Structure 1
Amino acid sequence: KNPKSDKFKVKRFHHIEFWCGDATNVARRFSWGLGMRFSAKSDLSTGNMVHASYLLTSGDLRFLFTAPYSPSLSAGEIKPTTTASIPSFDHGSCRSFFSSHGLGVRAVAIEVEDAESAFSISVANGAIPSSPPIVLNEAVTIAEVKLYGDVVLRYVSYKAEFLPGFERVEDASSFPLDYGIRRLDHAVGNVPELGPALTYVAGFTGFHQFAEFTESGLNSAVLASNDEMVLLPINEPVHGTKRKSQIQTYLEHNEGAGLQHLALMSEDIFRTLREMRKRSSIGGFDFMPSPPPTYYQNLKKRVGDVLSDDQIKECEELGILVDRDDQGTLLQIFTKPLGDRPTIFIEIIQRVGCMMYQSGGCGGFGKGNFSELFKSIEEYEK
């Protein structure tokens, strides 16, 4: 059921911000590996003496890559006089974040109808504030509250192009890469305690529970906005098994709670993963090992309704996993970690079904794949 209990009007996922040591090199790496275009910049060349920020886009997917300059460049500035385009940026918070966590997501940004309203209500409903609502060039309002660990939920509202103080990137350095990725489907957090984190975040958003899982590694539950286009899974470790919890492994190397992965919807996961796998070893992203043939044999038994033999065969060529709900079918695959630490990674998905537009969360999140993976793996050893 859906109680539709949001405490403010939430529109959609807007952007994701990575805090980096060098924004250029991460952004250029992500651009090539994922097929996103360089579409906006705020830096020294735009008069920003505080931080370097570069935005990649694929469809409605926006990845923001931010790093601090030397504080010496903005030593004569104060917040009222700042040249930063992102007023919540802080040299010391950025360097502490990166030093503690390595490369990772700092902000999960959602568009709302009124960022100042959304901030006040949230804090009035238990959210720890992180940056109060600031109006940019009387056009855009932004505000931040704590989500989990050092990750912030960022509210954005527009009166009526990315942010003031950003510039459209010169056509020549903006090469129209595109491998089929269109928007952010969901963002998954890992915490030491799922209960308090669910209570906290549902407390100040009014987001409702969408799904849950539990017997191998984790417990999780998903919060969702009213129309369930903003989807926030949260995991916790389950201590006590033959294998160490990967959630727990995450928390160690990340120095605590943080964002685990971003699931990016592709309008054509076949072309997307062909393009990504072509580039895996020339600067792109690597992919988790592909399931055994066993798996893909059992898929004709599970989704032969949904995917032809040839489409199943293409799933096998590319290591794609398939789960099915009572309502939809989910094609999914995972990258290896995006940086040095085994912390953040990326998932590519495409959903089949739930036509009415397509309703969010169609097909679930893969909870059936745990079983079928081990079940198929027993059968490959044979």
Structure 2
Amino acid sequence: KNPKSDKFKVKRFHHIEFWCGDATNVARRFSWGLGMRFSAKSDLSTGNMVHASYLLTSGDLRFLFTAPYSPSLSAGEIKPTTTASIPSFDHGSCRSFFSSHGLGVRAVAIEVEDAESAFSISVANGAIPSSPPIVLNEAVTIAEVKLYGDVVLRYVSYKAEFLPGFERVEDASSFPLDYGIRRLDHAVGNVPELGPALTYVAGFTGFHQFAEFESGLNSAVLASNDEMVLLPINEPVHGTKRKSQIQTYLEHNEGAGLQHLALMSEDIFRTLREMRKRSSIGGFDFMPSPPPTYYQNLKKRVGDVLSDDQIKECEELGILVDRDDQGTLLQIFTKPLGDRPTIFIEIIQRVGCMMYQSGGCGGFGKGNFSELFKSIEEYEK
């Protein structure tokens, strides 16, 4: 059931911002590992004496990488006179974030009709404000509120290229990499207690629980009116035999934060061949593949949807497959993006629920827990 109860008009995911110590090296690593192009920059070369920010793009997916310069470069400035292109940036806030969490997402940004309004209603409805609405070059409006831990939900709205004060990147320096990733599908939070986190976020957004159908976690998914903005949240399950990975996240991250980004590919086979090609030459590693007993049970579950040639292709690439009642999903998970066992990336492709494709089509793969356990026990014997 979809109550369509957003308290303000929410369009789509707009970008994801990583807070870094060196934005250049993370950016060039993500670019190659994921096949994202260098699109825009705000840095010393553009008159930004405060922070270096580099934007990567694939399809509609926007990854922003930001690090602080020495505060001494802008010691003479004040907020009215700043050269920061993102006015919410704070040197001390950024340094404390990276040193507390390591590499991680600072902002999940969603486009909205009216950012100042979305901020006002949000804060009226329980949101802890993080950065008040600011109007950039009479063109774009930006506002921030707390989401969980040190992660903010960022509202951006346009009266009528990324943000003012960014420059488009030198096409000689900008190589058109592309491995098929097109857009952000969901962004997932880890918290110590799911109940109060859900109440708070649903409280100020109007987002509703997105319905779906003894290991790991309890989770629930918050969704906008058209279920195109999707913000799941996990909490750990204590007491089990095997330690909760959610609980391992919270230990190494020093508390709650963004756990994974799910990136939709238009061709999850091309994407996964291209990323796997580069795993050991600067790219990303993937979680261990499931045992062929898995793929030996996929015919009896999705053989309707995928040909035996296409299941074998899942087998070589290590792709996992789950099924809702309206659609099917193909998914795989990278190893953690940095030093700590915290944030990782998910690649997904959704098949079904054509009307455009409705959001969440197929769910989020919580069935793959049961099938992997079954598979593992099958393969053992």
CA contact (8 A) 2:19 2:105 kept: yes
CA contact (8 A) 2:33 2:284 kept: yes
CA contact (8 A) 2:107 2:154 kept: yes
2 CA distance for matches of 1:262 and 1:112?
A: 20
1 CA distance for matches of 2:259 and 2:236?
A: 12
Summarize deviations over 1:83-110 as a string: whole Å, max 9, x none.
0000000000000000000000000000
Partner residue in 2 for 1:370: 369
Partner residue in 1 for 2:342: 343
CA contact (8 A) 2:180 2:267 kept: yes
Summarize deviations over 1:45-104 as a string: whole Å, max 9, x none.
000000000000000000000000000000000100000000000000000000000000
State the Cα distance separating 1:211 from its structure 2 match. 3.1
Partner residue in 2 for 1:11: 11
State the Cα distance separating 1:157 from its structure 2 match. 0.1
Task: For residue 15 of structure 1, give the secondary structure of its aligned residue in structure 2.
Answer: strand
Partner residue in 1 for 2:280: 281
State the Cα distance separating 1:204 from its structure 2 match. 0.1
2 CA distance for matches of 1:117 and 1:212?
A: 32
1 CA distance for matches of 2:164 and 2:296?
A: 52
1 CA distance for matches of 2:303 and 2:162?
A: 43
CA contact (8 A) 2:212 2:363 kept: no
State the Cα distance separating 1:212 from its structure 2 match. 5.9
Task: For residue 306 of structure 2, give the secondary structure of its aligned residue in structure 1.
Answer: coil
Partner residue in 1 for 2:31: 31
State the Cα distance separating 1:381 from its structure 2 match. 1.1
Summarize deviations over 1:163-191 as a string: whole Å, max 9, x none.
00000000011000000000000000000
Task: For residue 273 of structure 1, give the secondary structure of its aligned residue in structure 2.
Answer: helix
CA contact (8 A) 2:23 2:53 kept: yes
State the Cα distance separating 1:306 from its structure 2 match. 0.2
CA contact (8 A) 1:187 1:233 kept: yes
Matched, 1:72 2:45: no
CA contact (8 A) 2:210 2:221 kept: yes
2 CA distance for matches of 1:99 and 1:166?
A: 27
Partner residue in 2 for 1:22: 22
CA contact (8 A) 2:333 2:346 kept: yes
CA contact (8 A) 1:328 1:353 kept: yes
CA contact (8 A) 2:104 2:343 kept: yes
CA contact (8 A) 2:218 2:237 kept: yes
2 CA distance for matches of 1:369 and 1:203?
A: 31
Paired residues in the alignment total: 381
2 CA distance for matches of 1:363 and 1:317?
A: 22
Task: For residue 53 of structure 1, give the secondary structure of its aligned residue in structure 2.
Answer: strand
CA contact (8 A) 1:85 1:164 kept: yes
CA contact (8 A) 1:212 1:220 kept: no
Specify whether residues 23 and 72 from structure 1 end up closer, same or farther in structure 2 by C-alpha distance, changes over 3 A only: same
1 CA distance for matches of 2:163 and 2:366?
A: 37
Q: TM-score, normalised by structure 1?
A: 0.99
Summarize deviations over 1:257-282 as a string: whole Å, max 9, x none.
00000000000000000000000000
2 CA distance for matches of 1:211 and 1:230?
A: 14
CA contact (8 A) 2:181 2:264 kept: yes
Specify whether residues 186 and 258 from structure 1 end up closer, same or farther in structure 2 by C-alpha distance, changes over 3 A only: same
Gaps (5+ residues) in structure 1? none
CA contact (8 A) 1:49 1:83 kept: yes
Question: What is the percentage of aligned positions where both structures have the same residue?
Answer: 100
Task: For residue 211 of structure 1, give the secondary structure of its aligned residue in structure 2.
Answer: coil
Moved over 6 A (4+): none
2 CA distance for matches of 1:24 and 1:276?
A: 20
CA contact (8 A) 1:322 1:369 kept: yes
Q: TM-score, normalised by structure 2?
A: 1.00
Q: CA RMSD in A?
A: 0.6
Specify whether residues 212 and 238 from structure 1 end up closer, same or farther in structure 2 by C-alpha distance, changes over 3 A only: farther
